[PDB]
Design an enzyme around this catalytic site. Structure first.
Site, short mmCIF file in Angstrom:
data_model
loop_
_atom_site.label_atom_id
_atom_site.label_comp_id
_atom_site.label_asym_id
_atom_site.label_seq_id
_atom_site.Cartn_x
_atom_site.Cartn_y
_atom_site.Cartn_z
N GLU A 35 17.87 -39.16 -48.21
CA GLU A 35 17.61 -40.11 -47.13
C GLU A 35 18.81 -41.01 -46.88
OE1 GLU A 35 13.64 -39.09 -45.89
OE2 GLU A 35 15.26 -40.30 -45.03
N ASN A 46 16.16 -44.16 -34.69
CA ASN A 46 15.33 -43.02 -34.34
C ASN A 46 15.16 -42.93 -32.83
OD1 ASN A 46 13.51 -44.15 -37.10
ND2 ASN A 46 14.83 -42.35 -37.09
N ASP A 48 12.50 -42.81 -30.99
CA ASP A 48 11.53 -43.73 -30.41
C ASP A 48 12.00 -45.19 -30.40
OD1 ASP A 48 11.38 -44.41 -33.06
OD2 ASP A 48 9.23 -44.05 -33.28
N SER A 50 12.73 -47.00 -33.04
CA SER A 50 12.61 -47.60 -34.35
C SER A 50 13.88 -47.33 -35.16
CB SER A 50 11.37 -47.07 -35.06
OG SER A 50 11.51 -45.69 -35.30
N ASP A 52 15.31 -46.76 -39.36
CA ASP A 52 15.06 -46.57 -40.79
C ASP A 52 16.03 -47.41 -41.61
OD1 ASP A 52 13.15 -44.55 -40.19
OD2 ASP A 52 14.66 -42.98 -40.36
N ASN A 59 10.75 -46.99 -42.19
CA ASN A 59 10.83 -47.06 -40.74
C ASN A 59 10.17 -48.32 -40.19
OD1 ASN A 59 9.41 -46.08 -37.91
ND2 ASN A 59 11.51 -45.39 -38.17
N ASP A 101 -0.64 -43.92 -48.65
CA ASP A 101 -1.24 -43.98 -47.33
C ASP A 101 -1.99 -42.71 -46.93
OD1 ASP A 101 -1.62 -45.83 -45.19
OD2 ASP A 101 -0.29 -44.62 -43.92
#
Length: 129
Positions: A35, A46, A48, A50, A52, A59, A101
């Site tokens: 990562e 990203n 969209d 957003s 990271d 994110n 989650d």
């Protein structure tokens, strides 16, 4: 801070990630390698809009607030900049919420595509843990 492999493994172990929700330490070190290349200051934008953040590329759409991801949440209740610290506590505590989650470490694309189903304990061999 750019961690060494074993240095990060030892830091993650002290923060309780070894076997957390059934994921052995090697999984977490493998995810961080791909990562962020073990760099706590890693950021990536990203599609969209957003971003990271940090060693585990958490994110802003869901997990932290960076003030520029409209309609996002802040489920870890932290500023995203806290995820860039040389102290990985904030990243680890947030990662624990993420992996709990429902989707496990599949939440990390790099883990799915580059760690899942591989010999992940290779990432901790030779370390004095």
């Amino acid at each position: 801070k750019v961690f060494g492999r074993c240095e990060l493994a030892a830091a993650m172990k002290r923060h309780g990630l070894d076997n957390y929700r059934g994921y052995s330490l090697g999984n977490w070190v493998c995810a961080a390698k791909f990562e962020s290349n073990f760099n706590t200051q890693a950021t990536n934008r990203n599609t969209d809009g957003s971003t990271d953040y940090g060693i585990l590329q958490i994110n802003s759409r869901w997990w932290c607030n960076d003030g520029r991801t409209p309609g996002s949440r802040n489920l870890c209740n932290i500023p995203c900049s806290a995820l860039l610290s040389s102290d990985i506590t904030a990243s680890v505590n947030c990662a624990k919420k993420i992996v709990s989650d429902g989707n496990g470490m599949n939440a990390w694309v790099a883990w799915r595509n580059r760690c899942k189903g591989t010999d992940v304990q290779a990432w901790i061999r030779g370390c004095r843990l």
